[PDB]
Design an enzyme around this catalytic site. Structure first.
Site, PDB file in Angstrom:
ATOM      1  N   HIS A 175       0.768  -1.179   0.114  1.00  0.00           N
ATOM      2  CA  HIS A 175      -0.009   0.021   0.244  1.00  0.00           C
ATOM      3  C   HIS A 175       1.185   0.774   0.455  1.00  0.00           C
ATOM      4  CE1 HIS A 175      -3.117   2.609   1.622  1.00  0.00           C
ATOM      5  NE2 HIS A 175      -2.945   2.507   2.961  1.00  0.00           N
ATOM      6  N   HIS A 199      -8.325   5.131   3.925  1.00  0.00           N
ATOM      7  CA  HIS A 199      -7.877   5.029   2.018  1.00  0.00           C
ATOM      8  C   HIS A 199      -8.672   5.933   0.885  1.00  0.00           C
ATOM      9  CE1 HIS A 199      -5.902   0.496   2.406  1.00  0.00           C
ATOM     10  NE2 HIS A 199      -5.538   1.431   3.744  1.00  0.00           N
ATOM     11  N   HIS A 255      -3.844  -3.883  15.690  1.00  0.00           N
ATOM     12  CA  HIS A 255      -5.567  -4.552  16.357  1.00  0.00           C
ATOM     13  C   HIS A 255      -6.570  -5.088  14.637  1.00  0.00           C
ATOM     14  CE1 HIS A 255      -5.151  -1.208  19.780  1.00  0.00           C
ATOM     15  NE2 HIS A 255      -4.287  -2.601  19.636  1.00  0.00           N
ATOM     16  N   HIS A 286      -7.137   5.772   9.673  1.00  0.00           N
ATOM     17  CA  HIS A 286      -6.811   5.791   8.991  1.00  0.00           C
ATOM     18  C   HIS A 286      -8.265   5.526   7.523  1.00  0.00           C
ATOM     19  CE1 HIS A 286      -4.293   5.876   5.371  1.00  0.00           C
ATOM     20  NE2 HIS A 286      -4.232   5.094   5.026  1.00  0.00           N
ATOM     21  N   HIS A 318       0.630   4.617   1.328  1.00  0.00           N
ATOM     22  CA  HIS A 318      -0.164   5.293   2.512  1.00  0.00           C
ATOM     23  C   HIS A 318      -0.265   6.489   2.044  1.00  0.00           C
ATOM     24  CE1 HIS A 318      -1.584   6.012   5.944  1.00  0.00           C
ATOM     25  NE2 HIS A 318      -1.631   7.121   6.349  1.00  0.00           N
ATOM     26  N   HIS A 328       0.662  -4.591   3.353  1.00  0.00           N
ATOM     27  CA  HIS A 328      -0.908  -4.466   3.558  1.00  0.00           C
ATOM     28  C   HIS A 328      -1.115  -5.913   3.818  1.00  0.00           C
ATOM     29  CE1 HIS A 328      -4.667  -2.259   5.174  1.00  0.00           C
ATOM     30  NE2 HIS A 328      -4.106  -1.563   4.954  1.00  0.00           N
ATOM     31  N   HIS A 366      -9.347   1.974   9.314  1.00  0.00           N
ATOM     32  CA  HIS A 366      -8.953   0.427  10.583  1.00  0.00           C
ATOM     33  C   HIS A 366      -8.412   1.745  10.874  1.00  0.00           C
ATOM     34  CE1 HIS A 366      -5.652   0.221   7.672  1.00  0.00           C
ATOM     35  NE2 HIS A 366      -6.415   0.391   7.452  1.00  0.00           N
ATOM     36  N   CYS A 367      -7.946   1.018  12.373  1.00  0.00           N
ATOM     37  CA  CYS A 367      -7.206   0.989  12.936  1.00  0.00           C
ATOM     38  C   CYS A 367      -5.541   1.072  12.496  1.00  0.00           C
ATOM     39  CB  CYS A 367      -7.077   0.968  14.156  1.00  0.00           C
ATOM     40  SG  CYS A 367      -5.681   1.636  15.476  1.00  0.00           S
ATOM     41  N   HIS A 368      -5.000   2.275  12.461  1.00  0.00           N
ATOM     42  CA  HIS A 368      -3.377   1.605  12.021  1.00  0.00           C
ATOM     43  C   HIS A 368      -2.192   1.127  12.638  1.00  0.00           C
ATOM     44  CE1 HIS A 368      -0.457   1.794   8.883  1.00  0.00           C
ATOM     45  NE2 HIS A 368      -1.420   2.510   7.844  1.00  0.00           N
ATOM     46  N   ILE A 369      -2.958   0.463  14.154  1.00  0.00           N
ATOM     47  CA  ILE A 369      -2.193  -0.008  15.011  1.00  0.00           C
ATOM     48  C   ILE A 369      -1.882  -1.618  14.348  1.00  0.00           C
ATOM     49  CG2 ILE A 369      -1.752  -0.719  17.331  1.00  0.00           C
ATOM     50  CD1 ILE A 369      -2.725   1.762  18.322  1.00  0.00           C
ATOM     51  N   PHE A 392      -9.666  -4.819  13.247  1.00  0.00           N
ATOM     52  CA  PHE A 392     -10.889  -3.202  13.835  1.00  0.00           C
ATOM     53  C   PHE A 392     -10.868  -2.776  12.681  1.00  0.00           C
ATOM     54  CE2 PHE A 392      -9.908   0.112  17.028  1.00  0.00           C
ATOM     55  CZ  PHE A 392     -11.594   0.261  17.424  1.00  0.00           C
ATOM     56  N   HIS A 435      -6.238   5.146  19.610  1.00  0.00           N
ATOM     57  CA  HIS A 435      -6.432   4.389  18.246  1.00  0.00           C
ATOM     58  C   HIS A 435      -6.213   5.383  16.863  1.00  0.00           C
ATOM     59  CE1 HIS A 435      -7.694   0.898  20.029  1.00  0.00           C
ATOM     60  NE2 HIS A 435      -8.623   1.120  20.160  1.00  0.00           N
ATOM     61  N   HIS A 478       3.645   0.332   2.653  1.00  0.00           N
ATOM     62  CA  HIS A 478       3.746  -0.865   3.343  1.00  0.00           C
ATOM     63  C   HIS A 478       3.265  -1.466   3.242  1.00  0.00           C
ATOM     64  CE1 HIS A 478       0.663   0.649   5.653  1.00  0.00           C
ATOM     65  NE2 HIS A 478       0.147   1.738   5.528  1.00  0.00           N
TER      66      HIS A 478
HETATM   67 CL   LIG Z   1      -4.207   5.347   1.731  1.00  0.00          CL
HETATM   68 CU   LIG Z   2      -6.002   0.406  17.906  1.00  0.00          CU
HETATM   69 CU   LIG Z   3      -0.609   3.204   5.959  1.00  0.00          CU
HETATM   70 CU   LIG Z   4      -3.361   4.427   3.136  1.00  0.00          CU
HETATM   71 CU   LIG Z   5      -5.516   0.324   4.725  1.00  0.00          CU
END
Ligand SMILES: [Cl-]
Ligand SMILES: [Cu+2]
Ligand SMILES: [Cu+2]
Ligand SMILES: [Cu+2]
Ligand SMILES: [Cu+2]
Ligand SMILES: *[C@@H]1O[C@H](CO)[C@@H](O[C@@H]2O[C@H](CO)[C@@H](O)[C@H](O)[C@H]2NC(C)=O)[C@H](O)[C@H]1NC(C)=O
Ligand SMILES: *[C@@H]1O[C@H](CO)[C@@H](O[C@@H]2O[C@H](CO)[C@@H](O)[C@H](O)[C@H]2NC(C)=O)[C@H](O)[C@H]1NC(C)=O
Length: 497
Positions: free
Chosen positions: A65, A402, A458, A400, A67, A112, A452-455, A463, A397, A110
């Site tokens: 991905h 997309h 999670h 994020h 980001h 994904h 989603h949460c980007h942790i 999540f 949290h 990163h």
């Molecule tokens: Cl994105």
């Molecule tokens: Cu989280």
């Molecule tokens: Cu990302």
């Molecule tokens: Cu993204």
């Molecule tokens: Cu994502």
């Protein structure tokens, strides 16, 4: 050196020791972090990703991905496994061929797939602006002004035991740092500046989990960009940066020639700076090659507060100036129990057929899309509001979206919304118990977009939801190349699905 916008990118396994402890990793370009991918605003990126992975302990499939890039008309190139593509199998390659109109700033890339980016597949992605409105504020902006903040684990991501707490073993700044336990005096990163010059530092959180309190002894930082969005100048002495966020700041090399500590304190893991953990070095040209002797203050005078940030351009806020003043106002019920996260009562488990492929095959409402209850349709050409009330364990949290950036109408720790001039960004902390962080955007980008949460731990625990934006126009808006069409059959064959 920076690579791109047209480049190969090999994904391999290798041993690395960024904190003095050797372990195998999943790497782009042979390094941690991966090489910086760069180009100019509007460029055509053609990133041919070669999957050369062979160690199953970190997964031999991959997907990447980009980001923060909107991917308008190229949803198939966005990267989230089982949302926009099936993974690339080992021994194969895939050309992510997309354009970046209307964007310029600091991004990253990163894996994904699962928790694979934690195992090392993470790097910076910079889109320069030849006509940047902030150009006159600094003298230097290049690979040497990128600062990455990363968490690093001794245990492999797939091997984190079920039911035990996950914490990192080191903080890495530009790929180097010291371990929290059994600390050894392994090399620290050095960022070099010349007395009198001004630098555009591009601060990138490539974290899988912690947020960092970032500061530079003796210096202050003037924020000029937030997650790709140019800001009014905001001078701060500390920045709390959450997973996946980016800031650019001007660093004025206006202190005496010397060595100064760069600090990045995570919210979990090792606390403080004993033995040089959580640290890097800002070295002026002509300074002695030795460690800094500087200290932090007890209390920072001007920490970043998100409501203090405002766009440089007149971006406003779409919709009407009150809660629910949108065409499609949503309030998500975000919860955690028994090891699993859920959104509106549904824990995300990736589907067998990617969401985009299900849509291109003729599924045309979100109740027909798998996973059931995890895909929410959004109407075209509409103002969307999403409230993200906090309280779920494991916070704060960083959520994020997309395909989009968004106005942050309500931020953490402050009950007052801002319908006039809030910052726009793509990853936002939803704060603490009783908060009501809320975002707004308009739907002008057909396709399935992950929220989603980007942790990453999670996300793996469910999540997430998918916003299927403008289902009816997805196929016409996103023509797919043959190589994309070939991913699912190749993956399903290799995995006996
Ligand atoms: Cl994105
Ligand atoms: Cu989280
Ligand atoms: Cu990302
Ligand atoms: Cu993204
Ligand atoms: Cu994502
Ligand atoms: C966060 O804000 C949303 C609106 O953006 C609130 O949603 C309302 O919730 C109540 C029940 O709590 C409903 O009767 C309304 O239909 C909702 N929409 C509105 C007022 O526009 C939500 O309650 C807020 N949550 C917290 C925790 O403050
Ligand atoms: C809490 O958030 C609100 C909304 O973003 C902030 O209020 C703004 O404060 C600025 C600076 O004084 C004023 O120019 C605006 O008119 C305010 N907007 C609104 C809608 O009230 C407020 O400053 C934040 N609180 C703290 C402590 O930072």
């Amino acid at each position: 050196a920076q690579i791109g916008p047209v480049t190969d990118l090999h994904i391999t396994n290798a041993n690395i020791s960024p904190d003095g402890f050797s372990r195998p990793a999943v790497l782009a370009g042979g390094t941690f972090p991966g090489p910086t991918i760069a180009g100019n605003t509007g460029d055509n990126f053609q990133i041919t990703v070669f999957n050369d992975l062979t160690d199953p302990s970190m997964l031999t499939d991959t997907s990447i991905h980009w980001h923060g890039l909107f991917q308008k008309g190229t949803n198939w190139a966005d990267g989230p496994a089982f949302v926009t593509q099936c993974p690339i199998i080992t021994g194969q390659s895939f050309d992510y061929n997309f354009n970046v109109p209307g964007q310029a700033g600091t991004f990253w890339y990163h894996s994904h797939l699962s928790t694979q980016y934690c195992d090392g597949l993470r790097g910076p992605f910079v889109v320069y602006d030849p006509n940047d409105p902030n150009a006159s504020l600094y003298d230097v902006d290049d690979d040497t002004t990128i600062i990455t903040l990363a968490d690093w684990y001794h245990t492999l991501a797939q091997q984190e035991p079920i039911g035990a707490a996950i914490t990192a073993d080191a903080t890495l700044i530009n790929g180097l740092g010291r371990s929290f336990t059994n600390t050894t005096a392994s090399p620290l990163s050095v960022i070099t500046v010349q007395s009198g010059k001004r630098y555009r530092m591009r601060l990138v959180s490539i974290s899988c989990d912690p947020n960092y309190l970032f500061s530079i002894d003796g210096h202050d930082m003037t924020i000029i960009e937030v997650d790709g969005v140019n800001s009014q100048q905001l001078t701060v002495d500390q920045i709390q940066i959450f997973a996946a966020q980016r800031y650019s700041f001007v660093l004025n090399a206006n202190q005496p020639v010397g060595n100064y500590w760069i600090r990045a304190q995570p919210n979990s893991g090792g606390q403080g700076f004993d033995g040089g953990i959580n640290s890097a070095i800002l070295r002026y040209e002509g300074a002695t090659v030795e460690d800094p002797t500087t200290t932090a203050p007890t209390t920072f005078s001007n920490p970043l507060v998100e409501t203090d940030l405002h766009p440089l351009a007149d971006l406003g806020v779409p919709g009407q100036p009150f809660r629910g003043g949108a065409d499609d106002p949503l309030v998500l019920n975000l919860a955690f129990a028994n090891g699993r996260f859920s959104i509106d009562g549904v824990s995300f488990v990736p589907p067998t057929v990617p969401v985009l492929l299900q849509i291109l095959s003729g599924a045309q409402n979100a109740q027909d899309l798998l996973p059931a209850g995890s895909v929410i349709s959004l109407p075209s050409n509409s103002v969307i509001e999403v409230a993200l009330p906090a309280g779920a364990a494991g916070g704060p949290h960083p959520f994020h979206l997309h395909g989009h950036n968004f106005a942050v109408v309500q931020s953490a720790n402050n009950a007052t919304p801002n319908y006039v001039n809030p910052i726009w960004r793509d990853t936002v902390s939803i704060g603490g118990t009783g908060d009501n962080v809320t975002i707004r955007f308009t739907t002008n980008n057909p396709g399935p977009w992950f929220l989603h949460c980007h942790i990453d731990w999670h996300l793996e625990a469910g999540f997430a939801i998918v916003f299927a934006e403008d289902i009816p126009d997805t196929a016409s808006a996103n023509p797919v190349p043959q190589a994309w069409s070939d991913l699912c059959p190749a993956y399903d064959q290799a995995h006996n699905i």
